[PDB]
């Protein structure tokens, strides 16, 4: 599935270029197989340009289109030259530079408007002067040789992002959101091209990288998503009464995770007895799950080891996931907090746990991994928590 593709590329490179992939070119190639956008940081000599060129070539096999962008006229000539000696004559490769032959230009220009091309090669000045025409193209791959040159104009950053299939409205909405110091999430139904930039110095400025990581399927930065706004509260008992009190104020959108299917059956019965609008996962998943998603049901009990942030507000753990399996705790609790319509909605997770040792393990681990704290019942401002939950959600639905 994924390794096969990488190797196909591996072989192709070896064959066409004449040598092996370098350590760096191998790391990069895997990325480009998982369709990841990235920033090339590496000292000059490693194999960046050659790789960007060979990538273009390989993608042109799948009929995919590329654009290669260099800071200087010499690099445009050089790369153009190499590319035309290396290509199967079937591959349509056009380049452009001011000092070009009038005949060669028109050839470019003709192919550029007819979209009869696979690989285009030009300079940062072409990008500056053809913002309109370029913005109307979707490329499967865009390689920018020295990004510090073209980063100079914010206008050009936009164009690049547009050349990979990202509509201006989305760039405007992302930039704006970042302006307000909030989180942007790219729409996952949009499948933009790959953007790879070479940075000579891993330059400082904060905005380009943010815009990029937000809009492009970038290399993963963090192990725990910044999109978590959750308070963890621990009650040191398995009291059903105490659970009932929490239910009484939580009221809606509640997930309960039992350690076993029996433990979850005992609770279900107890909550059905006290006439709570409840449902379980085991007997009839899809019916209950959709009643919960609708509103018909307020509480969904389930079992650890197995709907919508709109819907999930409160997560309750009837016993700590055994391990503690912190990974599962983190995923589950993370259900109660998700960016919704541009808003990082509020969530609350409560753990019923008698065992001090178990809970001490989960607690220290969670602080080490998520950097998130687990407070005791008595530190908990239920009124503020519930309010945060309701109001955060109420902002989201303003759309
Ligand atoms: N995989 C490889 N194995 C051996 N030599 C390579 C490889 N890739 C590129 N080269 C050679 O290294 C030289 C410089 O590489 P280049 O792609 O220009 O790196 P950078 O963009 O980091 O300066 C080129 O002349 C090229 O022939
Ligand atoms: Mg180079």
With the most atoms of ligand 1 within 8 angstroms of its CB, the residue from 25, 50, 144, 200 to mutate is: 50
Q: Is 94 helix (H, G, I), strand (E, B) or coil?
A: strand
Minimum CA distance residue for ligand 1 atom 5: 19
Resolution in A: 2.4
Identify whether residues 199 and 235 lie together within a single domain. Answer: no
Beta strands in 124-178 (DSSP E): 141-144
Q: Is the dihedral of CA 48, 174, 118, 101 positive or negative?
A: negative
Cα 173 to Cα 338: distance, rounded to the nearest angstrom: 19
Residues 164 and 195 sit within 8 Å (Cβ to Cβ) = yes
Identify whether residues 29 and 132 lie together within a single domain. Answer: yes
> Per DSSP, what are the bridge partners of residue 258?
303, 318
Identify whether residues 234 and 293 lie together within a single domain. Answer: yes
Ligand 1 proximal residues by C-beta, below 6 Å: 19-22, 25, 42, 44-50
User: In angstroms, what is the span from residue 197 Cα to ligand 1's centroid?
Assistant: 16
User: In angstroms, what is the span from residue 218 Cα to ligand 2's centroid?
Assistant: 22
User: In angstroms, what is the span from residue 391 Cα to ligand 2's centroid?
Assistant: 52
| C-alpha distance across the termini of the chain, in Å | 39
User: In angstroms, what is the span from residue 14 Cα to ligand 1's centroid?
Assistant: 13
Cα 78 to Cα 62: distance, rounded to the nearest angstrom: 24
Identify whether residues 86 and 173 lie together within a single domain. Answer: yes
Cα 247 to Cα 297: distance, rounded to the nearest angstrom: 13
Which atom of ligand 1 is the closest one to the Cα of 52?
Answer: 17
With the most atoms of ligand 1 within 8 angstroms of its CB, the residue from 13, 47, 202 to mutate is: 47
The contacts of residue 285 (CB under 8 Å, 6+ apart) are none
Identify whether residues 25 and 94 lie together within a single domain. Answer: yes
Q: Which of 182, 183, 155, 158 is nearest to 170 (CA)?
A: 158
Residues 339 and 183 sit within 8 Å (Cβ to Cβ) = yes
Minimum CA distance residue for ligand 1 atom 9: 47
Q: Is 164 helix (H, G, I), strand (E, B) or coil?
A: coil
Q: Give residue for tokens 């953007």.
A: 195
Burial of 188 by CB count in 10 Å (0-12 exposed, 13-18 middle, 19+ buried)? exposed
DSSP letter at 313 equals -
Identify whether residues 72 and 213 lie together within a single domain. Answer: yes
Identify whether residues 264 and 142 lie together within a single domain. Answer: no
Residues 126 and 96 sit within 8 Å (Cβ to Cβ) = yes
Is the N-terminal amide bond of 137 cis, ω within 30° of 0? no
Task: Please report, to the nearest 10 degrees, the dihedral formed by the alpha carbons of residues 159, 160, 165, 170 taken in order.
Answer: -60
> Per DSSP, what are the bridge partners of residue 349?
232, 315
Cα 236 to Cα 353: distance, rounded to the nearest angstrom: 5
161, 187, 220 - which closes a domain: 220
CATH of the domain at 378: 3.40.50.300
How far from 240 is each of 235, 266, 267, 275, CA to CA, in Å?
11, 11, 8, 14
User: In angstroms, what is the span from residue 46 Cα to ligand 1's centroid?
Assistant: 6
Cα 378 to Cα 288: distance, rounded to the nearest angstrom: 34
Residue 286 structural domain: 221-315+320-399
């Amino acid at each position: 599935e994924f390794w096969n593709e990488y190797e196909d590329f591996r072989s192709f490179f070896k064959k066409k270029f004449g040598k092996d992939l370098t350590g760096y070119q191998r790391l990069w190639a895997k990325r480009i197989v998982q369709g990841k956008s990235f920033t090339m940081v590496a000292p000059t000599g490693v194999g960046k340009t050659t790789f960007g060129m060979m990538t273009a070539l390989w993608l042109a096999r799948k009929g995919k289109k590329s654009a290669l962008v260099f800071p200087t006229v010499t690099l445009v000539k050089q790369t153009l030259e190499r590319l035309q000696k290396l290509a199967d004559e079937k591959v349509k490769i056009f380049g452009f530079y001011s000092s070009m032959k009038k005949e060669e230009k028109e050839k470019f220009e003709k192919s550029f408007e007819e979209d009869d091309y696979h690989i285009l090669v030009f300079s940062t000045q072409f990008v500056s002067k053809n913002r309109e025409k370029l913005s109307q193209k979707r490329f499967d791959f865009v390689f920018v040789d020295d990004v510090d040159a073209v980063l100079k104009a914010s206008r050009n950053i936009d164009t690049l992002l547009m050349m990979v299939g990202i509509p201006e409205e989305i760039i405007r909405k992302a930039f704006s959101t970042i302006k307000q110091g909030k989180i942007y999430e790219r729409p996952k139904n949009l499948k933009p091209g790959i953007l790879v930039v070479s940075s000579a110095t891993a330059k400082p400025r904060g905005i380009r990288p943010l815009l990029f990581r937000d809009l492009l399927n970038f290399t993963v930065g963090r192990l725990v998503s910044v999109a978590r706004n959750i308070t963890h509260v621990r009650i040191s008992s398995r009291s059903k009464e105490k659970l009932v009190e929490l239910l009484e104020i939580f009221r809606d959108g509640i997930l309960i995770f039992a350690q076993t299917e029996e433990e979850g059956k005992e609770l279900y019965e107890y909550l059905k007895r006290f006439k709570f609008n409840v449902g379980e996962t085991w007997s009839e998943f899809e019916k209950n799950f959709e009643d919960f998603k609708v509103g018909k049901i307020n509480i969904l009990i389930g079992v650890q080891a197995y709907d919508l942030p709109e819907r999930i507000k409160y997560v309750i753990f009837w016993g700590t996931p055994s391990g503690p399996d912190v990974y599962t705790y983190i995923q589950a609790s993370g259900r109660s907090s998700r960016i919704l319509n541009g808003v990082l909605v509020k969530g609350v997770s409560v753990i019923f746990e008698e065992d001090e040792e178990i809970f001490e393990s989960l607690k220290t681990r969670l602080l080490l991994i998520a950097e998130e704290e687990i407070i005791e019942e008595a530190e908990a401002n239920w009124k503020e928590l519930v309010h945060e939950v309701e109001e955060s959600r109420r902002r989201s639905e303003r759309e």
